[PDB]
Design a protein around this ligand. Sequence first.
Ligand SMILES: [Mg+2]
Ligand SMILES: [Mg+2]
Ligand SMILES: [Mg+2]
Lengths: 196, 222, 196, 249, 242, 243, 204, 244, 231
Amino acid sequence: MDIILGIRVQDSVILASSKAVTRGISVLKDSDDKTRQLSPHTLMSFAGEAGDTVQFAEYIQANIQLYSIREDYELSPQAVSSFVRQELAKSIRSRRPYQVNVLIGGYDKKKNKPELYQIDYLGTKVELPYGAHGYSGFYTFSLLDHHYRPDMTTEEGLDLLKLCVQELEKRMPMDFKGVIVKIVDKDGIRQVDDFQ
Amino acid sequence: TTIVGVKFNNGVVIAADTRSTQGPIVADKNCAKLHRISPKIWCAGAGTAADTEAVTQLIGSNIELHSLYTSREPRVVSALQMLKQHLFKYQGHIGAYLIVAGVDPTGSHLFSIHAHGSTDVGYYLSLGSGSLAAMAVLESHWKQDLTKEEAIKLASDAIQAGIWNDLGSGSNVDVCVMEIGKDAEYLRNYLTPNVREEKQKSYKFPRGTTAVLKESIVNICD
Amino acid sequence: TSIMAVTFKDGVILGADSRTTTGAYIANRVTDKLTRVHDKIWCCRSGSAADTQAIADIVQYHLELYTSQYGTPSTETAASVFKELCYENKDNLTAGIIVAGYDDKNKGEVYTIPLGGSVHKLPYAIAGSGSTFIYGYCDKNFRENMSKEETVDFIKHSLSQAIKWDGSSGGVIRMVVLTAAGVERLIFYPDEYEQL
Amino acid sequence: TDRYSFSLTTFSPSGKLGQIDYALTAVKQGVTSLGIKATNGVVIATEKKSSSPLAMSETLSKVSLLTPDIGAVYSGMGPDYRVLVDKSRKVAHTSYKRIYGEYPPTKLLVSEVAKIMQEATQSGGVRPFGVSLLIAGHDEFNGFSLYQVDPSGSYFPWKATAIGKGSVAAKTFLEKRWNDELELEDAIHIALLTLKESVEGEFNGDTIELAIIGDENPDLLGYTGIPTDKGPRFRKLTSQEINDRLEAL
Amino acid sequence: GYDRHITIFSPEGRLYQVEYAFKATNQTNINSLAVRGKDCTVVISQKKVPDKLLDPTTVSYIFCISRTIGMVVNGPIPDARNAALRAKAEAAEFRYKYGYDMPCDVLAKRMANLSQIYTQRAYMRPLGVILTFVSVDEELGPSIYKTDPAGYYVGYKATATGPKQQEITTNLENHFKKSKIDHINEESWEKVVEFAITHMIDALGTEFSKNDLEVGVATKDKFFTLSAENIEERLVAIAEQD
Amino acid sequence: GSRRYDSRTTIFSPEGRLYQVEYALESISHAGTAIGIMASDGIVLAAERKVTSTLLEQDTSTEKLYKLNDKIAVAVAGLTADAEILINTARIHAQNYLKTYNEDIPVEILVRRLSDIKQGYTQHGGLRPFGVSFIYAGYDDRYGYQLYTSNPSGNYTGWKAISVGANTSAAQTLLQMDYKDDMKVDDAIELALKTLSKTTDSSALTYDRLEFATIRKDGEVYQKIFKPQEIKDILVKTGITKK
Amino acid sequence: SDPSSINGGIVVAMTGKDCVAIACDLRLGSQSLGVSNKFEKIFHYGHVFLGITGLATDVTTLNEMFRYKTNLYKLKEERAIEPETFTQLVSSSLYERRFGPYFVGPVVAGINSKSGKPFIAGFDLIGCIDEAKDFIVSGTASDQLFGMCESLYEPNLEPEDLFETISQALLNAADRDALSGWGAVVYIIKKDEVVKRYLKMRQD
Amino acid sequence: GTGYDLSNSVFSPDGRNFQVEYAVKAVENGTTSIGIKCNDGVVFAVEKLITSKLLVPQKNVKIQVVDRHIGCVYSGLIPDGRHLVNRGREEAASFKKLYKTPIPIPAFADRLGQYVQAHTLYNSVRPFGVSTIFGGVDKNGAHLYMLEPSGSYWGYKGAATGKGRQSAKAELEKLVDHHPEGLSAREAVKQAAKIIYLAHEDNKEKDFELEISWCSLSETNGLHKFVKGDLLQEAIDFAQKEIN
Amino acid sequence: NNYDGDTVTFSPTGRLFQVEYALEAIKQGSVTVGLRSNTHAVLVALKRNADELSSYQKKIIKCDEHMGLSLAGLAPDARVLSNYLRQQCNYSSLVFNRKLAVERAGHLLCDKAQKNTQSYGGRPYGVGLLIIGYDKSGAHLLEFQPSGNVTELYGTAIGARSQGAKTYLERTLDTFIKIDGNPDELIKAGVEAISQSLRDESLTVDNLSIAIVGKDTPFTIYDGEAVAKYI
Ligand SMILES: [Mg+2]
Ligand SMILES: [Mg+2]
Ligand SMILES: [Mg+2]
């Protein structure tokens, strides 16, 4: 499937998302940003069934923006994760469910702590130091479990994600055409200019 | 599961085993299967245990409401009609098979209800997995004009047959006798022929055997 | 199940067996397959016990309301009620019903309604599993305007042959005689009709 | 169809809710009914005034059972009381027993009937209930309780009170006679005295209804074999018992 | 003032449309009496056919609800037949759903709850009719239960309804004060019919012919309205007192 | 047909006022007095029971102060049953927010929900408004302690100290006279008790005619509903009564 | 693909002398792939404890629903809900979705505050109440837990011994299941003291 | 108080529904219609005022057929009568569908009566403005019914409603007295023509057209049929002789 | 008086007032006359303009190739009723391959109006209609009033000063009923009938509308110069 990776360092959360969208035997685009900025300090990467991903992501984005406008306050990452998990759990038993897996990376400004949530199309939410959706984990975890330290800096996390991307580009039957990397910290969400 | 009902001269008795099984595994070794539709109207269940419990409680609540509305003692025909109509509404999807006995102002009643909404009347009935063994015992030892003790013995022997010769039943025997002139008598563990033998050795571990990483008090108060 | 209804000069007689089987196991060997929908309008049931019982209960309700409002219903009226209930729910019912009635105007009448809701008025009607085994005998031994004894004998012989050949039938032969004199219930045990 | 979607009970410029006050007035013009809470049970009582001596008073019950441990008496319009007791008996199962497997507590059943009556005072096309209810119940955690429910949907817990015609005088007698150390028989005697004060006609076990939420009566359970299941606490006194306690006085 | 048009409380706490329905109940100018026998229950109603162009066999205020429950109505025939159809449907549905015949008191309570609904909801008016149901309930015996447009219902040893009802009622009361029982100690229903007709003649003070009365008798497992000839036989038996 | 009986509750007067809103406010004016005071370290609610009898069981009686949430409570002025309907709805909304976001509901969100329900009852439906005024006392990690007030008009406002019910003008004047921004929770208790004792139409302020509540503070708040004995103790301590 | 066997996990409750115990594994995974080793399955409402095994999303949704209902219950009744009442509530809530079931296996444990009676019970995915006095087991290693409990348990055990027994049962059952493990927690519940202990086990 | 006559289903302090009585007045303002039960059926007759010679004679039928055996003629607000006849036709179709047997006359009468009584039960519906005389032959013989706007309906030997209802009732009483054995179908037709012609004199300002139908077990085999042609002209001549 | 607020309220004299107000609305409308022989049926209508810069409101509507109607009163209600009649003719032609009988059309219109003259919140229709048609029975002319009363006539007229045209048709009935097989003569008779209802006005090509139906003559409308030969 699409590659969706996320790591939580001491003062940041880094998200990696495939740049490739392929329908059939033809790669339609090699520069696809599979993320949606839910709030100034909370980003969400998504992957899964065509169409459902962008639809669900933009729906969640609109709801979070409406809440932030109404209450003039940014919801904590935990609240956004719980809201999207409830949405997906309501979806699973609907007529046509959403088949979208998401990684939410946020910086709780009230706690000043990085937080990373992994939720699947079923509504299974977990708070993890590193997370991945699809087959990606099947490789990346093995690296992270060894090379992840809680006191890691953002540059160390970027190097670790680059090692994961190298392993994926070596042992994956697919060419996901690189990854767009985004950093979520106390100052918001920024995009790495180049990762390869 | 093995459930039976037998009519005696002054009422009706039901009996069942106490073995709830999740496939080939015994989930409960003492699950009472005699439910109370009304103070003097009882029923034994088989099939989807959740369906039996739920439909029996629902019909019992509706019967209590009907009795408080009509100021009359509940009738077995009413519970029978409501159960059968409800089961037929939801087709065979409600997997409940009931043997419903009772004593009401009209007399003694013993019926059987199937999951799809059919009902049968008889003097002796059996349902469940072991229904065949129990029915063989009934057909072998049933006679007209049974006494209370005779019907109790016949029902207990049918349940024992279902316990011994059917893998779907076992453990103990619950009985409920309902006579016309008295209250319903609910004998829990009327027969206990499956007491477990004493184990050859005690497995109480020496304290500290388990490796503990961290302990924490849990605040239940506020 | 083996059921039939025969019209003789004094009225009508319904006959049935008492064997209800779940597969090859005789679930109930004393089943009363003769059901009363009105004082002198009865029905023989075959097929889904749940379906036939529900149909008979609803017909009894409708006929009780008809009696309360407009008086005693005709046999044809109960036949039409059965026909509506069976035909409109043909995709969810598996029931074959014979309806026999006595009214002083038309003497005795028999209406058989098989699967599909079609209604056919006949002097004598046979149905059930065992009926196929007695289609010949009946056609060779049935006469119009028989006496009560001759009608009982005809039904007894037919049901006895059906019970002998059809394993789905058995038990005791139950008959309900509807005449101007009223309703009579007759039972014939195996030790009697087997020697016929 | 029901085009009466607008409220029939509205605020008057004086701030008073008209139909609520009118229903309370109709209650005041109803037969007196009282309740007294003791240390080992509660008692409710009322006068059985019949329309005709040909009518059989036993067939018309002013004291009804809501749950096996909760009963209720009223003062006001009989038919409203009947429909309210039916609704309460059903709500006891639908909104508690069928969810928690236990009979509702007195407070919650009172709250449910009060919600029904409040909706009657606020919904469209309906007049408030022309009754006031005295509900006496017992649950394991709150013990014994006696509540009063007014047409407005409000409810109050009472140590002892009364409603109807002779409401004020009855309440005064209870204020003068009540204490927090009363046994059930003492409360029954006080209730009988207050009713005798509030009745002019005949006063015997055949013209007054009186029920008690007291101890558990396993003889009224109907089945034996379940030790955890005990008998109901609600019991309506027989005419013989009332006449005995009256001849005692 | 609109407290007189819809079913809302007056300042006195009174529902005036209910009282006006009560007033409408006596519009028919016919009286009815119900009494209980040892194993039967008899209702008698005045049969008044003023117009000679009327089919006298279609003038009835006694209805056969079920095979056990009969109902005599005091009030206009539209609301009478409405309540009759509703009670018949309720009894049939009760039999279908609960497996046994609807009791007299149960049908009375149901109709009284519907009448109460009419008093509380505004879009429906009460029916200007008083319904007296009679039967021989298997659990309660001979049963007479009456309901009114106010939603009130109760059972009676004997009852009367109509314009001169009070008169009749008093008479009945006296008899019970003399009899020390709650029923008519007669084994045959013919004697109970004769008793009812005799006491109605005593109260109203009028002689009834065979075309001036409707008699409905409920015995165990049956309710039937007598013909003019059976009423005539009872009247002849009464007249042959000495 | 039925048009002759419609009171038309949701209409404007020629002056631009909602008739039923004004009449419900007039109704609440006759109800008991409820006062909320928010100090720097807590919130205090004090209400006077209009219903008073020597036989009224005050131990199990709660006619003025209800718990919406472990962080939010309400003082009621007006029709108790309408208030309880709205309180049930508020509890359901708070638990829905908790289930949705796994965080306790902020006070203003619940207050705005209840106020919008009230407002909807004043603009459509042709139904009578709820004759209830609410004083919300709540705590959350955003605005700390919070005191809100809502009336049948559907309007809600925030206050340092507020009073609803009877004699609200004199109570508000006394509060403005004696309130201080730096005062503590015990000072708020004393001020509320004195304001009630000086604005009560009754002879004296006693425990039987009082309901009391304190939302205090570890990282945990305590919502303490005073029992009758605690109420009599705080009355005799603040000098209002003698024992 | 079995909805109850996608995520895996196990829970087991036992009783003793004036004490109960409820233990669970800490594994959550998408079939073969283990995802989280911190997924606890025993939640507590007041003094009642509920361990849910099965589809993880249904576990979390049921936890939220029961927290909702218990909070409203506490605010209405003005008392903490008891284990029997909560068991009945769980059964009714489960059967409320009979034809759209929650693919879970709830297990309730506690001590009645007013009577002190230790009470444990189990359920299926549609709410069939299994009220056993000895032990209740649920999860993917249901058979291993059944064997361990039927072998090791003896009634009237003191808390310090009941802990060892339930911990050994949980560990030796999880080590025989590929879809359970990655850590374990054990609650020893007394009338006024509830202790939580994390166990040390193999992380495979 | 006042205002009890402004809303339907409102009981006056007497116990009356004034809107129903006003509808009865609207009926009394209508033309004259009669029904006569004979020994083997019923005969319906109605007067149609020829407001102008521009009206097409023998057209603009006023008697409506229900099922194949029921005849209905209404006096009052003709459109309301058509509404009631359509409702009755639906009821008869439903009855025949469910119970196969054609709807009996008493059943049909009770259906119409319950419909009208429901129309006298709510302030959102106006009472009916037609008195309907109907009937026919069923398995129990002949039946003639009349239904008033109050929902009250009765079985009649002879019925009449409209402006000339009183003279028609008097003539029907004479017919009932002089014929205890019962009238025949054609004799009933001739008497209905006579009574219609006699009641027209009350409003002799404009000419009228006679319309007759009948349902007889022997003359029409139990089917509702319009009397036309030779029999109609014979009845007209009989009436013309009877007047003078 | 106090009984004219709704159509659900009966006057003490048994009169529904709103219906009479609708009839009065018709009376103040324009004049339209209808007349038929055995072979044809003609509607002649006088359209009315707001001023000299406005158009003349259409008064004749085509319902089907064999049936049409002329309106007098509220044009919206006329359009609603004509659309319902078109729907009924269309249903007859599609489900039964059968031309809708004119008498049945009148019955349907009667019941449709009665639906409005008995229920709360509904106003009676405010237009009178003159329906001409040619079914299997021959030529038919019906007059429909929103009271629900539809009457078949040889000729009639509705609107302002309609009594003059009606009396003219009464006098000329035996004359026009025999104008069979000659369309123009019946058209001129209708023009004379409507002229019998003119006062300070004269028939022009702009204010006159004609409609003709009959055997081998579908419902056709003539406006403008097409009517110049009949003036
Ligand atoms: Mg075995
Ligand atoms: Mg493992
Ligand atoms: Mg492993």
